[PDB]
Structure formats: structure tokens, C-alpha cells
Swiss-Prot record:
Domain of life: Eukaryota
Annotated GO CC locations: chloroplast; chloroplast stroma; plastid
Chain's role: Functions in the biosynthesis of branched-chain amino acids. Catalyzes the dehydration of (2R,3R)-2,3-dihydroxy-3-methylpentanoate (2,3-dihydroxy-3-methylvalerate) into 2-oxo-3-methylpentanoate (2-oxo-3-methylvalerate) and of (2R)-2,3-dihydroxy-3-methylbutanoate (2,3-dihydroxyisovalerate) into 2-oxo-3-methylbutanoate (2-oxoisovalerate), the penultimate precursor to L-isoleucine and L-valine, respectively.
Name of the protein described by the UniProt record: Dihydroxy-acid dehydratase, chloroplastic
Gene Ontology MF terms: 2 iron, 2 sulfur cluster binding; copper ion binding; dihydroxy-acid dehydratase activity; hydro-lyase activity
Gene3D superfamilies, A to Z: IlvD/EDD C-terminal domain-like (3.50.30.80)
Keywords assigned by UniProt, alphabetized: 2Fe-2S, Acetylation, Amino-acid biosynthesis, Branched-chain amino acid biosynthesis, Chloroplast, Iron, Iron-sulfur, Lyase, Magnesium, Metal-binding, Plastid, Transit peptide
UniProt remark on cofactor binding: Binds 1 [2Fe-2S] cluster per subunit.
Family label: Belongs to the IlvD/Edd family.
Activity regulation comment: Is highly competitively inhibited by the fungal sesquiterpenoid aspterric acid, which is effective as a herbicide in spray applications.
Pathways per UniProt: Amino-acid biosynthesis; L-isoleucine biosynthesis; L-isoleucine from 2-oxobutanoate: step 3/4; Amino-acid biosynthesis; L-valine biosynthesis; L-valine from pyruvate: step 3/4
Major enzyme class: lyase
Amino acid sequence: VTADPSPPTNKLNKYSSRITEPKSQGGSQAILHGVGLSDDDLLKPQIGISSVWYEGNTCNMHLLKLSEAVKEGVENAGMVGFRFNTIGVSDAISMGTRGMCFSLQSRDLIADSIETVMSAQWYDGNISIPGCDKNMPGTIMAMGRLNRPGIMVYGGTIKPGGMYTANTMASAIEAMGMSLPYSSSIPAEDPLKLDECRLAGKYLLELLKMDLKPRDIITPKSLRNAMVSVMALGGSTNAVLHLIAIARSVGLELTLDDFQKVSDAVPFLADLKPSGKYVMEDIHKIGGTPAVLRYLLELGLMDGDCMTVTGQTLAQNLENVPSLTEGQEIIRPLSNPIKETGHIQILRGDLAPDGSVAKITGKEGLYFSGPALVFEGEESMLAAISADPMSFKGTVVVIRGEGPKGGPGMPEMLTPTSAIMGAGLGKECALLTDGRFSHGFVVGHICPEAQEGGPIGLIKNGDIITIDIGKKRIDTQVSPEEMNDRRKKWTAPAYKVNRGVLYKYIKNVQSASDGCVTDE
């Protein structure tokens, strides 16, 4: 990985010394005096404090207050804090609209934004404060690219809330060692969240002293630890995209098959929404994410040797945290899991030769077969089920043209599943897409996407499609020869945009099986 400037040693200001020390950078030193730094301040490490505050989301509107507390803690630790802020967007607002095409890519825009500031200003370390919206992997990606000491302070989940994308990624990033213990489970606005904010500077100081960097913390074993927490907690299928993108940001490899092997190895244990009963605050009340990881470590499912942002290993952090409170019913014992293996399932077969991702409870059966009902986007599928719902009974519904390039932006879709459920068809049809979905067979991330000429773009109404969970295949009864005949006659649709951020995304984005990374 070659992305960002190299430092010009046991100095704690390895990067900011580029502009604070040499006399040829007096213009830099003059601006720093202008923003409040004294001569003694020029000797100190400089920490970029990157929040994702914005007022259009309950999950993000309070983060300036957290950023202020982080800055106070950085100053108390003998360093200089520089706050800055990037954008984020709310899926709760945009779900069901074309605004959702802008959501996933904002992860990669946040990564670009933080990388840009840290690189241009020569900051020695970063503390990032994402909210409980869905873009927090972008902060970790920036840290991986820069490879300067960093800590992610989760804004916290709003209490009344289950293992959706934010709770999934926050817990996974804590399990990965990139957030302090309890960061993922302390509720938003809890007094202890402000205290964590004020302590991040102390911990980051120690990481600068150790020079413990993101590529020292994010390793194949800590990536596995993150995947273990996703499987054990029933986390979102979006975690496949984000953990692959994080792995690539530190120069590591992570494939769909790696997820399948952890899923096969780790039972689903957490009685948490959407699958189960409880929410993250209920986990907070029984000992939090550290208690959960402590149990998983005792079961031998995690590697305790991995270094973390506390400056100690995972096992050392967990050695003395209170265990799961006696009698709790949220985390099942190994003997009575909610599912023998993980919920996340990778499927290939004729129609998803490069992979796809399903959440499988184990209660939907092992097979589905039905004639294809094909739609070129969410809108026409919803119109059809409104006007003629019984035409859907027994079908495999295909919503295509919703991938990274075709959508564009790989939008997440909620209305198709609630419309199917509203019509009484939940177990009576299957749902397939090259995009993403938010009681039957539901498969997303199908690769190659229709816009790229993948077999999903060649399906016709009436083709018999068979989903086989045991074989992990989505097949068609159409012969491979006739599928190749259709491929020969296929032409890519025109892109839906020709300018702006989404056109750049089309130009840059890789497949869903590659985590939709944009910088390769």
C-alpha cells in the first residue's frame, strides 16, 4: 500500500515535525501560532479529531459535544487537538427513495475525506467519532491507509436498536481491537460515553509512545475476531462489504469464502433483534460487548493474542472485565445456540458464479424452486406486487440493475420484503438481487451484477430457478449453452448518470464480492 506521505525514531510527533521543526516551514509555524499554538505547543503531537456530526440524523446530531470532550482529553494528555468533520447520510431518511443510491458510497467518501485532512496537515494520530448511522467503516479505512495511530470512538447506539449495520460494525470494530472496551455497547449520550471521549487522548498518547499503528492491530487474526463477533451476534450482511473493505485498506486479503469458514465455525448465540428479542442496551446492562467477547474467548472462538488500542492484547483487556451477568438470557450457551452455525451464507451456482450473500436462520427449509419473475428495479417490482400480488406466489423474484454500477450505488431495499410479507407471500416466494435487502429465501450481493453482464442480467421470466442452501448454489434450469447464447446477444444498459459523485462511483467501484472498494 502506497497512499499517504511518509514521516521525515522515538519522537511522538513523527509527522507534525515535518512542519513544526524545520526553518523552511516558517509559514506553517506561523499559521499554527495563528490558530492558538505556543512555542511549546509546537513540540507536541498533533491529533486530528474527525467527527461525523450532522443535524439530519438523531444518530449524529450530538457528536460535536463528543468531539469537544475528545479534544479536552487530548489536551490533558499533553497533545494538541485539531477538530474537523466530514459528511454522513441517513438511510432512515432516504430508504425507499433514489437518495439511497448515495448511501454506501459515502463510506468511501468519508475514508477519502479523513485521509485527505490527515495527509495535508501532517497530524500524528487520529481519533474518529462516527455516529450510529452506517458509515463508520470509512473511518477505519482511512486509518488503515494512513497507518498512523488511531482510535475509533463510537458515538453510541440510541437507547429506547438491534444488530443492524451500526451495532454490527461497532461491535465488530471493538472485537477487531480498534475501539476501546465498551465503546460499542455504551448508549449514546451516556455519561460513560463522554468519559470514554475524554480518555481517548490518554490511550492514544500511549499508542504514539509504542508506535502501535492500525496495521499492527488490524491483522488476519483480528479480522477473524471481528468476523466471529458478527456470526455470534447475528450481525448484518453489510458487514461482509465493510470488513472486506477494511481488510483491503491495510493491504490484507479477505474473501467471501473466509466468511463462510467462520460462519461454519461459530454458532449464532445472541437473542438480539432483528432475529431475536433484545437490543444493544440490554447487552450493556449484562456486561456489554467485553462480556460477550470474554465468553467467546473462553469458548476458544477468538484469538486473545491480538494487540488493541488499549496498548494491551484482547485477552489482557478481557482478563478482568465482569462476565455476562448470572442468569442472563440474551447470550445462549454453546450447548443451546440459536443456530449451530452462523446466519451468514455464501451462495454461488449458475446465477451467482462470483458469489452472493444471504442471511439464513435455519427455519426456512433447505430448498426453493420457482419460475423467475424479473424486474429491472425496485419501482416496477413494487408496482407489480400492488396490482397483481398473486402472480408472485411460488416465484423467484429477481430485482436486478441494483448493483454498485447498475443502481448505481448498490442501494439497500426494504419495501420489497415488507410488500411480500404484506401480501401474505413471505414463505411462498424467494427474492434475489444484485443490490442489498434490509421468513423466506432472500439473497443479495449477487455477482457479477446485471450491469456487468452477470448471469442475473440474462434471466428471463419463467426460467426455473432453484436455491439449494446445502449445496450453496443458485441455479437455473436454462442450459449453460442457452445462457451463453443470451450473453452473446446482451448489451450493457446505459448508465443512469453521467456526472457527479455517482458517476465517479461507477467509474471506480469494484464488485460486491470485492467489498465495493473504489481505490484499486
